[PDB]
Design a protein around this ligand. Structure first.
Ligand SMILES: *Cc1ccc(C(=O)NCc2cnn(C)c2)cc1
Ligand SMILES: *Cc1ccc(C(=O)NCc2cnn(C)c2)cc1
Ligand SMILES: [Ca+2]
Ligand SMILES: [Ca+2]
Ligand SMILES: [Cl-]
Ligand SMILES: [Cl-]
Ligand SMILES: [Cl-]
Ligand SMILES: [Cl-]
Lengths: 9, 228, 228, 9
């Protein structure tokens, strides 16, 4: 289950 | 970071993100917050991206070690090292929560800032809950739920159903329900209602806003597909 | 790490590698080295893998920042932050070199350990040379060359041409020639002769040794393809 | 130009 990716700015 | 200019801290946070130096990025953004001024939309994103990456690495490592530890209970080293990583993770979560409490949230009056910070508060208590096992797992879960709920209430009143902050908040609260609170029905209901109400609002958006919202709606759909 | 058992340090280094916690891995292996006992083949690999990953992240970040810095010279923040990363990288290289000098190399008598450590010495001076710009770039380059050369001399005398340590040493020395010493012809000649002499020795190997050697020979071939 | 990957143990 995926949360929101705070991957890239 | 008290001797560095706020603008220099922000500029170096952006450089650190480009260099994938997320520990540095977080320390720069922590210094920027401690200057005492409110954060712009872009600056809030930098703060969130930095700590999300740092704690994301710690969570991934903790899960690897916790899995090894459980396979061994079917010397003290595996437990000791899992404990060390867990303590470092809790320290990072406590640091972020301290920044929100001193004093980001109390000065955040606009919906876009206040909902963003309260979602953050829910997220970092959720990360604490992931590793909690003692007399305070319940209180940590309730702290996460309370922050998410206040953010939810504001976002329903003040933001359109396609707002990316509102959508990402609902996504993470639904993950909270499913993974932390043992409420998969609430998780599925929230994700479905969030998706459907956003779908009905898409006609109001520009081409660029449409892409932003549909991207996050796909994440809600991916979870629903996994959960049903 | 003075209060932790050597065996516990080794065990935790292996756990850290599984968790991709390479900074921890390096600190555990540094503690193991400082116990003063020689390292086994497996333990030497753990030491090398840990620091290779740590400095590999720093080199990647330094290149990102150096590229930004050069695009700006066509405030002081980009230079300052590149300098900070560069100083941290140099500290890691100095730490590894200190471990080799106190006292890994002087106690290493077998070809497999001595060549491995001397290749390491060449590698970490090569990393120092990558960022060197002052009155000591020449001396750093000569320190790398001297370590590689001593390792080369031992490996020719004591190891078969397919030995993976010998092959990886020649691979990295050829990269030294090409990238650091401005000697692309020497780099190409070394890679070609290394490949050809290994090819002629493959018939002596088991199925598993054959896979180990041909894998590294492919890396020599990839470089030759890029260089010619 | 690739050096030897000290990627995995
Ligand atoms: C709280 C929060 C909401 C939304 C975002 C966001 O827009 N992230 C970018 C993104 C959109 N779709 N993906 C996969 C990433 C961040 C934080
Ligand atoms: C100095 C040194 C020599 C050889 C090796 C090694 O065998 N690494 C594993 C490997 C083989 N092929 N690839 C792509 C990785 C490490 C260090
Ligand atoms: Ca100022
Ligand atoms: Ca002992
Ligand atoms: Cl530990
Ligand atoms: Cl305000
Ligand atoms: Cl800096
Ligand atoms: Cl010895």
């Amino acid at each position: 289950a995926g949360s929101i990716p705070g991957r890239r700015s | 970071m008290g001797s560095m200019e706020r603008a220099s801290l922000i500029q170096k946070a952006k450089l650190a993100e480009q260099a994938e130096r997320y520990e540095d990025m977080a320390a720069f953004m922590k210094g920027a917050v401690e200057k005492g001024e409110e954060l712009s939309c872009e600056e809030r994103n930098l703060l969130s991206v930095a700590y999300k990456n740092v704690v994301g690495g710690q969570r991934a490592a903790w899960r690897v070690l916790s899995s090894i530890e459980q396979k061994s209970n079917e010397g003290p080293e595996v437990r000791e090292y899992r404990e060390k990583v867990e303590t470092e993770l809790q320290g990072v979560c406590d640091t972020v929560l301290g920044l929100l409490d001193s004093h980001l949230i109390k000065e955040a009056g606009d919906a876009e800032s206040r909902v963003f910070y309260l979602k953050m508060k829910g997220d970092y208590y959720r990360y604490l809950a992931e590793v909690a096992t003692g007399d305070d797992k319940k209180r940590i879960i309730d702290s996460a739920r309370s922050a998410y709920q206040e953010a939810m209430d504001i976002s329903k009143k003040e933001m359109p159903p396609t707002n990316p902050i509102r959508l990402g908040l609902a996504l993470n609260f639904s993950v909270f329900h499913y993974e932390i609170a043992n409420s998969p029905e609430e998780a599925i209901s929230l994700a479905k209602t969030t998706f459907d109400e956003a779908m009905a609002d898409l006609h109001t958006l520009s081409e660029d806003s449409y892409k932003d919202s549909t991207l996050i709606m796909q994440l809600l759909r991916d979870n629903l597909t996994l959960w049903t």
